[PDB]
C-alpha cells in the first residue's frame, strides 16, 4: 500500500489500453486482454488480493460529475 496506489494510477492513464473513465478497472483489464494489446500481470495481482474496496476497484475520477 502507497506503492500499489500509484501502479493503478499509472495503469489508468496509459493511452494504449483505452479511453476509460466510465467503467470499472478489471473490466478494462479484461477488455485489453481479449484484444491482447499487452496487459501487464501486476495490475491483475493487486485486484485479487483485495476485496471490493472502492479505492482499488474504481477509476480515478469515479467521483467528479463528468
Amino acid at each position: 500500500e502507497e506503492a500499489e496506489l500509484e501502479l493503478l494510477r499509472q495503469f489508468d492513464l496509459a493511452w494504449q489500453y483505452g479511453p476509460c473513465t466510465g467503467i470499472t478497472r478489471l473490466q478494462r483489464w479484461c477488455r485489453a486482454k481479449q484484444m491482447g494489446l499487452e496487459p501487464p500481470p501486476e495490475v491483475w495481482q493487486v485486484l485479487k488480493t483485495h476485496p471490493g474496496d472502492p479505492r482499488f476497484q474504481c477509476s480515478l475520477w469515479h467521483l467528479y460529475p463528468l
Partner: protein, 1010 residues
C-alpha cells in the same frame, strides 16, 4: 528568442531621430552637465528599434499673486523672498523648504473664475528645484511663516498646482503616443554610458525636441510588440493554490508584431519532460528555479512593448514574485527596462459612482505597459458574468484534475500544454477583435493624457488636461476652490404619461447633444460668469449679457469667448467624424464596435458638463449646472406646447395631435393616422419645423415611429421599430423592462421576451396565454433546468451590506469547508439559487451555491419562483390590454395548471410500486391494477413514446461535448458552470435510468440466452 533588428549607422551630427513614445518617467539624478530631476522617454522607431531618451533641465513651478505692499515690487524683497531667514524661530519656516532655488519672477496674468475685466495683474512665478518640495512649501507659505521683512503678509493663495509630467506635456505640446523628433547636432548618443537596456540611447536638452501633431502622415502607428502569457499551478484537493506550497508547473507565451495578421512567436515552458507540439517550441527542466530563470531571460531578450493577459495583475505576477522569493532565486524580479531595479507588489483602490469600487494590486515595470483585459471589460461593459468562458461565448462562441495530468505521463502533459496555450491565445484575439488598442491610442491623442492613465484614473484628469491646454493660449491661471459641502440642485423634468397600449403610430422627436449645445450657444463658462455686482453700475443689458431661469447673468459673445465651448466643439467634431466613418460598415459586430467608439466620445463630452457640478472634485461652479438644467426644462415644455398647438383640426390638418410622453430630451407625439408613411412625413415636417426657433447648433430631429406601442410607467415602455417604410421593421425596443435588467432569473426575462414577441408581432393573445401556461406547468412538474433559476447580485462595499441583511452577502460570508481561499471579494458578482425550507421570515436563509446544490442535490422552492419571481412582471404586462378579468384569466390559467404538481423515515420505503393506471399502492410487483388490468396494451403504448424521446435527447447532448472538446477518441472533462451543456447532460442519465426501470415492470419481449 527572436531579437530586434540591429541599429546600423546612426551618426548624430548629420542625422536626426524620429521615434514614437510610449511611456514617460521621472528620475532624480546625478551626472549633471557641467537640474536634478531628469525625464525618461521610451519609444520605438519607424522600423522597430527601441529608443530610450534622457531629457535634462526642467523644474516644477507654480504661481501666486504679488501682495500690494512695498515688498514684491522691489527687487531687494524679491531676492529676500529667495533668501532664508537666519533666526532660530524660523526652523519651522526655512528648513523643510530651506535653500532651494524657488527664485523670483514677475509676470502679468489673470485668474480664471468669473468675469472682472480684460485687464491683467501682476503675479509671482515661483520655481522649485524638486517636485517633492512643492508639498512642504505649500505647508510653509500658507500656514507657515511669511513674515519676511514685510514683503508678503499672509496669506496669498497658491494657483496651478498640477502634476509634473502633465506640466511637461502641457508645456511642450506633446500628447499620448506622439511622434517626437531630435534634430541634427542636438543629441548625443554616447554621452550616456548604458544604464538601461535599449538599443539607441540619446541624451538631449528639453528645448531641442520637436513634436509632430498627429494628422496627415503623422497618424500612423509603429510596429509594437505584444506579449500574452498564462501559468499553471498544481494544488491540493479542495485547497485553492497558495504561493508558499504550490509549485508553478507551466508557463505559456504568445507574441506578435502589431499589424501582422498572425503571431510570430509561440513558446511553452514545462517542468517535466514533454511531447512535441507542431507550431511551437517546447523546453523542459527538472527544477522550478531553471523555469523561472528561463522565463526572466526570455522576457529580457524579446523585450516587449505591451504585456496583456486575463487576470494577470491579481493572480499571475504576484504569484510568480512570491514563488521566486520563497525558493531563493535572486535574479528573478528584475523584469523592467532599467538594469538595476527590482519589482514590488503594491495595493491600490479606485472608487466612483459610475463603476463602483475596486481594489487591485499593481506590480512595477518601468518602460513596459500593462493591459489586463479583465479590467478593460469591467470598466467598459455591463454584463452578467465576467468569466473568460462567458465573455468568449458572448463575443466569439465557445484544479485537482491538473495535478494528476501532471503526475502521469508525457502525453497527458502535452494535453495540458495545448490547453494552456489556447488559454494564453484567447485574450489576443479579444484585444484585436474588439478594437481596444486603436481606441486607446485615439483617446490618448484626443485628450492629451498618457497611455497608462486610461487604465488607472477617471474622467477628471482628462478635462483638467484639456482646460490647461486651452488656458495657456490667452494667459489665465486656475484657482483652487474646495468646499465641503454644498447642496443639491434640481435635475430634469419628466412629462406625465397617458399609460397603456397604443395601436396608432407615435413619432419620436428629440434633440441631439443637448447639454453641450446649451453650453455652446448661450456662451456659458467659468471665464464669463458675471458676479451679481460687477454689472453695476454699468447699465448695458441688451446684447452684452443674458439672464437664465435660475437667475444668473452671463456675458454675450461680442465681449468674450469661453473656454468650455471650444473644448466641447473639438469633442463634438471628433464624434461626428467617428459617426461619418461608422455610416459605411456592413458587418454587425464591427458596426457595434464603432458605435462603442462614438458612445465613448459622447460620454467624454457629457462628463465635461458633469465636471462643473461635482462638489467633491477640483473646480465646481453649480451656478452653471443650474443654468443648464433650467434651459433644458424650458426647451422641452416649449417643444410640447408647440407640437400639440400647431397641428390641429382647425388649422387644415386631419386630427389634433396629443403628446403622450416626454423624458428630458425626447417627445413621443401621437399623430392620429394609422399609415406609417403619412406619420413619417408629418413627423419629419414637425422636427424640421420646430428646430427653427433656437440658436445654433440646437436642432430637433425625427428618429423613429413606434407601431404598436406599450407604455407601463415612467422609464418603462416597449414598441416596434421603423427606420424607413420599405425597410419594414427593424426589431423591438424594451426600455427598462424585465428583459434587460440583471437582477432576475433567465426564465423570467425569456418569458417576458417571448410574450412580447407573441403579443406584438403576431398579435395572438391565445398563444401567449398557452405559452405562459406551459412555462408555469413545466415549472411545477419539475422539468426546468437550473441554468434558468440562477440569480446574481453584486457584492459592493461591506458596511452598506452590514446595515441590512441580504441573501448574496450571507452566501459569500459563509465560507465553505472545502476552500477558505476562494470566495467572492468586493466588487464581483455572487450567483445563487433559492432552495425550499420552512423559514418563511427569511429568504436569506434559503440561498445556496449552484455547484453545491448540484453535488448535494437539494430541492427547489417552486412556490417562491411562482409567486415572487414570475407573477408580478406578468401582471404588469398582461393587464393594460384587457381589464381585471385578465388578472383572473392568467390566475385561472394558473388554476387549471396549478393542480398538477410533481415532487429519517423517508429511507425505509420501496419494495413495491403503485399501479400505473390509477395510483393504488398494493402488494406484488406487477405494473397493472386488477380493475385496470384489461386496459394494458394502451398503457404500454403510453410511456414507450416517452422512453423513445428520452433516448433521442441523451445522444444529441453527449456527442456535442465531443465536438466542443475537439477529440473523438478521449474522455470529456469540462465542468464549465457557465455552459448549459453541463448539468443538462447530467439529469437525462437519471431520467433514462428511471424510465428504463419502469418498463421492466412489464416482462421481457423475448428470450436472450438462445
Amino acid at each position: 528568442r527572436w531579437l530586434r533588428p540591429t541599429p546600423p549607422a546612426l551618426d548624430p551630427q548629420t542625422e536626426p531621430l524620429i521615434f514614437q513614445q510610449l511611456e514617460i518617467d521621472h528620475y532624480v539624478g546625478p551626472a549633471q552637465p557641467v537640474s536634478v530631476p531628469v525625464l525618461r522617454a521610451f519609444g520605438v522607431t519607424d522600423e522597430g528599434f527601441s529608443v530610450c531618451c534622457h531629457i535634462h533641465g526642467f523644474a516644477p513651478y507654480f504661481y501666486t499673486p504679488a501682495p500690494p505692499g512695498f515688498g514684491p515690487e522691489h527687487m531687494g524683497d524679491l531676492q529676500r523672498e529667495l533668501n532664508l531667514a537666519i533666526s532660530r524661530d524660523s526652523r519651522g519656516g526655512r528648513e523643510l523648504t530651506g535653500p532651494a532655488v524657488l527664485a523670483v519672477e514677475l509676470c502679468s496674468r489673470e485668474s480664471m473664475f468669473g468675469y472682472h475685466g480684460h485687464g491683467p495683474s501682476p503675479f509671482l512665478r515661483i520655481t522649485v528645484a524638486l517636485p517633492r518640495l512643492v508639498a512642504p512649501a505649500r505647508r510653509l507659505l500658507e500656514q507657515g511663516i511669511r513674515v519676511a521683512g514685510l514683503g508678503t503678509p499672509s496669506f496669498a493663495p497658491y494657483e496651478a498646482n498640477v502634476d509634473f509630467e502633465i506640466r511637461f506635456m502641457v508645456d511642450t505640446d506633446i500628447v499620448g503616443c506622439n511622434w517626437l523628433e531630435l534634430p541634427a547636432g542636438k543629441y548625443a548618443l554616447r554621452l550616456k554610458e548604458k544604464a538601461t537596456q535599449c538599443q539607441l540611447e540619446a541624451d538631449v536638452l528639453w528645448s531641442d525636441v520637436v513634436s509632430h501633431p498627429p494628422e496627415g502622415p503623422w497618424q500612423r502607428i509603429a510596429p509594437l510588440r505584444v506579449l500574452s502569457f498564462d501559468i499553471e499551478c498544481a494544488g491540493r484537493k479542495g485547497i485553492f493554490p497558495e504561493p508558499e506550497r504550490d509549485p508553478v508547473i507551466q508557463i505559456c507565451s504568445l507574441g506578435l508584431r502589431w499589424g501582422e495578421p498572425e503571431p510570430f512567436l509561440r513558446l511553452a515552458l514545462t517542468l517535466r519532460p514533454c511531447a512535441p507540439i507542431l507550431g511551437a517550441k517546447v523546453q523542459s527542466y527538472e527544477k522550478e528555479e531553471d523555469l523561472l530563470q528561463a522565463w526572466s531571460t526570455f522576457i529580457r531578450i524579446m523585450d516587449p512593448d505591451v504585456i496583456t493577459g486575463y487576470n494577470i495583475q491579481n493572480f499571475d505576477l504576484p504569484y510568480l514574485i512570491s514563488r521566486a522569493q520563497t525558493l531563493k532565486v535572486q535574479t528573478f524580479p528584475f523584469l523592467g527596462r532599467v538594469a538595476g531595479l527590482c519589482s514590488n507588489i503594491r495595493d491600490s483602490s479606485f472608487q466612483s459612482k459610475q463603476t463602483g469600487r475596486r481594489d487591485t494590486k499593481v506590480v512595477s515595470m518601468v518602460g513596459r505597459v500593462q493591459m489586463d483585459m479583465l479590467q478593460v471589460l469591467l470598466r467598459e461593459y455591463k454584463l452578467r458574468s465576467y468569466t473568460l468562458n462567458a465573455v468568449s461565448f458572448h463575443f466569439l462562441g465557445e484544479h485537482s484534475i491538473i495535478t494528476d495530468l501532471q503526475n502521469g505521463n508525457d502525453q497527458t502533459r502535452r494535453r495540458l500544454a495545448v490547453y494552456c496555450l489556447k488559454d494564453a491565445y484567447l485574450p489576443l484575439r479579444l484585444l484585436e477583435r474588439l478594437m481596444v488598442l486603436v481606441n486607446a491610442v485615439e483617446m490618448a491623442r484626443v485628450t492629451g493624457v498618457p497611455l497608462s492613465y486610461l487604465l488607472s484614473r477617471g474622467q477628471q484628469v482628462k478635462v483638467v488636461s484639456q482646460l490647461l491646454r486651452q488656458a495657456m493660449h490667452e494667459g489665465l491661471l486656475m484657482p483652487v476652490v474646495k468646499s465641503e459641502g454644498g447642496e443639491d440642485y434640481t435635475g430634469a423634468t419628466v412629462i406625465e404619461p397617458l399609460k397603456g397600449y397604443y395601436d396608432v403610430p407615435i413619432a419620436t422627436l428629440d434633440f441631439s447633444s443637448l447639454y453641450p449645445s446649451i453650453m455652446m450657444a448661450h456662451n456659458l463658462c467659468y471665464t464669463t460668469l458675471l458676479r451679481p455686482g460687477t454689472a453695476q453700475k454699468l447699465g448695458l443689458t441688451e446684447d452684452q449679457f443674458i439672464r437664465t431661469p435660475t437667475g444668473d447673468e452671463f456675458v454675450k459673445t461680442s465681449v468674450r469667448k469661453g473656454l468650455l465651448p471650444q473644448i466641447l466643439e473639438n469633442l463634438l467634431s471628433a464624434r461626428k467624424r467617428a459617426k461619418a466613418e461608422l455610416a459605411k460598415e456592413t458587418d454587425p459586430l464591427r458596426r457595434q464596435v464603432l458605435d462603442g467608439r462614438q458612445l465613448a466620445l459622447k460620454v467624454s463630452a457629457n462628463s465635461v458638463y458633469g465636471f462643473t457640478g461635482a462638489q467633491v472634485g477640483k473646480l465646481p461652479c453649480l451656478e452653471i449646472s443650474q443654468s443648464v438644467t433650467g434651459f433644458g426644462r424650458q426647451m422641452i415644455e416649449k417643444t410640447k406646447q408647440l407640437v400639440e398647438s400647431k397641428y390641429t383640426v382647425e388649422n387644415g390638418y386631419s386630427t389634433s395631435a396629443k403628446v403622450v410622453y416626454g423624458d428630458t430630451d425626447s417627445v413621443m407625439c401621437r399623430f392620429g393616422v394609422s399609415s406609417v408613411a403619412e406619420a413619417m412625413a408629418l413627423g419629419r415636417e414637425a422636427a424640421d419645423w420646430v428646430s427653427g426657433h433656437f440658436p445654433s447648433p440646437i436642432r430637433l430631429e425625427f428618429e423613429k415611429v413606434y407601431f404598436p406601442y406599450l407604455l407601463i410607467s415612467k422609464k418603462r415602455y416597449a414598441g416596434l421599430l421603423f427606420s424607413s417604410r420599405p425597410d419594414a421593421h427593424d426589431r423591438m425596443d424594451c426600455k427598462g423592462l424585465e428583459a434587460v435588467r440583471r437582477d432576475n432569473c433567465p426564465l423570467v426575462a425569456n418569458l417576458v421576451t417571448a410574450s412580447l414577441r407573441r403579443l406584438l408581432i403576431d398579435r395572438d393573445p391565445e398563444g401567449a396565454v398557452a405559452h405562459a401556461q406551459d412555462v408555469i406547468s413545466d415549472l411545477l412538474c419539475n422539468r426546468i433546468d437550473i441554468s434558468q433559476l440562477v440569480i446574481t447580485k453584486e457584492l459592493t462595499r461591506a458596511a452598506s451590506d452590514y446595515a441590512g441583511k441580504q441573501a448574496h452577502v450571507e452566501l459569500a460570508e459563509r465560507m465553505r469547508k472545502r476552500d477558505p481561499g476562494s470566495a467572492p471579494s468586493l466588487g464581483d458578482r455572487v450567483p445563487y439559487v433559492i432552495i425550499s425550507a420552512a423559514k418563511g421570515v427569511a429568504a436569506y436563509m434559503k440561498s445556496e451555491d449552484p455547484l453545491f446544490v448540484l453535488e448535494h442535490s437539494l430541492p427547489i422552492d417552486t412556490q417562491y419562483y411562482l409567486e415572487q419571481q414570475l407573477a408580478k412582471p406578468l401582471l404588469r404586462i398582461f393587464e393594460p390590454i384587457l381589464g381585471e378579468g385578465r388578472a383572473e384569466a392568467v390566475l385561472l390559467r394558473g388554476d387549471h395548471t396549478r393542480c398538477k404538481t410533481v415532487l429519517g423515515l423517508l429511507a425505509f420505503a420501496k419494495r413495491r410500486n403503485c399501479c400505473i393506471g390509477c395510483r393504488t399502492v398494493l402488494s406484488h410487483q406487477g405494473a397493472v391494477c386488477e380493475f385496470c388490468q384489461p386496459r394494458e396494451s394502451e398503457l404500454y403504448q403510453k410511456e414507450v413514446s416517452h422512453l423513445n424521446a428520452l433516448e433521442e435527447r441523451f445522444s444529441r447532448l453527449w456527442t456535442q461535448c465531443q465536438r466542443c472538446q475537439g477529440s473523438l477518441h478521449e474522455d470529456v472533462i469540462c465542468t464549465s458552470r457557465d455552459c448549459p451543456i453541463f448539468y443538462m447532460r447530467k439529469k437525462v442519465r437519471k431520467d433514462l435510468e428511471d424510465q428504463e426501470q419502469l418498463l421492466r415492470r412489464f416482462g421481457p419481449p423475448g428470450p436472450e440466452a438462445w
